[PDB]
Scaffold this motif. Structure first.
Motif, short mmCIF file in Angstrom:
data_model
loop_
_atom_site.label_atom_id
_atom_site.label_comp_id
_atom_site.label_asym_id
_atom_site.label_seq_id
_atom_site.Cartn_x
_atom_site.Cartn_y
_atom_site.Cartn_z
N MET A 131 0.85 -1.22 0.00
CA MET A 131 0.00 0.00 0.00
C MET A 131 0.87 1.25 0.00
O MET A 131 1.43 1.64 -1.03
N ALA A 132 0.97 1.87 1.17
CA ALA A 132 1.77 3.08 1.35
C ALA A 132 3.24 2.74 1.19
O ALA A 132 4.01 3.51 0.62
N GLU A 133 3.62 1.57 1.70
CA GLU A 133 4.99 1.09 1.67
C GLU A 133 5.57 0.89 0.26
O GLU A 133 4.98 0.22 -0.58
N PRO A 134 6.75 1.47 0.00
CA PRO A 134 7.41 1.34 -1.30
C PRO A 134 7.86 -0.09 -1.57
O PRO A 134 8.03 -0.89 -0.64
N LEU A 135 8.06 -0.41 -2.84
CA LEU A 135 8.50 -1.74 -3.24
C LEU A 135 9.78 -1.65 -4.06
O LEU A 135 9.88 -0.87 -5.00
N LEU A 136 10.77 -2.46 -3.68
CA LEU A 136 12.04 -2.48 -4.40
C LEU A 136 12.16 -3.80 -5.13
O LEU A 136 12.27 -4.86 -4.50
N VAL A 137 12.13 -3.74 -6.46
CA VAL A 137 12.25 -4.91 -7.29
C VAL A 137 13.66 -4.93 -7.88
O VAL A 137 14.03 -4.05 -8.66
N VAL A 138 14.45 -5.93 -7.50
CA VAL A 138 15.82 -6.05 -7.97
C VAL A 138 16.09 -7.24 -8.88
O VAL A 138 15.80 -8.39 -8.53
N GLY A 139 16.65 -6.95 -10.05
CA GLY A 139 17.01 -7.99 -10.99
C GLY A 139 18.49 -8.21 -10.78
O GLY A 139 19.25 -7.25 -10.74
N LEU A 140 18.91 -9.46 -10.62
CA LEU A 140 20.31 -9.76 -10.39
C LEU A 140 21.01 -10.15 -11.68
O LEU A 140 20.38 -10.62 -12.62
N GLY A 141 22.32 -9.94 -11.72
CA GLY A 141 23.09 -10.29 -12.89
C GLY A 141 24.46 -9.67 -12.84
O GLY A 141 24.81 -9.01 -11.86
N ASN A 142 25.25 -9.89 -13.88
CA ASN A 142 26.59 -9.33 -13.96
C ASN A 142 26.65 -8.29 -15.06
O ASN A 142 25.98 -8.41 -16.10
N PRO A 143 27.41 -7.22 -14.84
CA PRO A 143 27.54 -6.15 -15.84
C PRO A 143 28.43 -6.59 -17.01
O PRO A 143 29.17 -7.57 -16.91
N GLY A 144 28.33 -5.87 -18.12
CA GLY A 144 29.14 -6.20 -19.27
C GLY A 144 28.34 -6.90 -20.34
O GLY A 144 27.38 -7.62 -20.06
#
Length: 180
Positions: A1-14
């Protein structure tokens, strides 16, 4: 609801890793950003890149670390503080050796299934009770080291399904945000 959501996609750069098994989280995160029409940008107080938007009326923060897989949680932790998100409200998309190729599952907690990236997040948040959107990649053939397997591209036949699989994962994340 009021609380924010952090969606993280994992992986390596490059570019060399853009299409590897261990990067599905990055791909899924990119579909989500496009679907929302949000673009990623440097977040200096964390080191990762972020994009913001809405889903199910919920305030959304999408992200991808800019460091390598093992140091992953090191950027997510301070990203959660900046946006003040509780671990429980953190969703992380990852490839999963314990699920068969293309099998998508949801879960808050449990083990890491040998995924080194998940272990740095737990290590960083001080808990394993953050949400996960698991994307099966199957187990490695015996002729290949588990760590090497995740850093190689998908086989020819697998590569054909990857796109539809990520679309299903993105949809899974959206529904998850909708009432998970």
């Amino acid at each position: 609801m009021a609380e924010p959501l952090l969606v993280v996609g994992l992986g390596n750069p490059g570019a060399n890793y853009a299409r590897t098994r261990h990067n599905l989280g990055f791909v899924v995160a990119d579909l989500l950003a496009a679907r929302l029409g949000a673009k990623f940008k440097a977040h200096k107080r964390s080191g990762a890149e972020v994009a913001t938007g809405r889903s199910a009326g919920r305030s959304l923060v999408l992200a991808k670390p800019r460091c390598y897989m093992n140091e992953s949680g090191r950027q997510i932790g301070p990203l959660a503080k900046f946006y003040s998100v509780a671990p429980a409200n953190i969703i992380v998309i990852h490839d999963d050796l314990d699920l068969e190729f293309g099998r998508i599952r949801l879960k808050i907690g449990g083990g890491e299934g040998g995924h080194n990236g998940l272990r740095s997040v737990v290590a960083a948040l001080g808990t394993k009770d953050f949400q996960r959107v698991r994307i099966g990649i199957g187990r490695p053939p015996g002729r290949k080291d588990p760590a090497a397997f995740v850093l190689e591209n998908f086989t020819p036949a697998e590569r054909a399904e990857v796109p539809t699989i990520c679309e299903q994962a993105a949809d899974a994340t959206e529904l998850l945000i909708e009432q998970g």
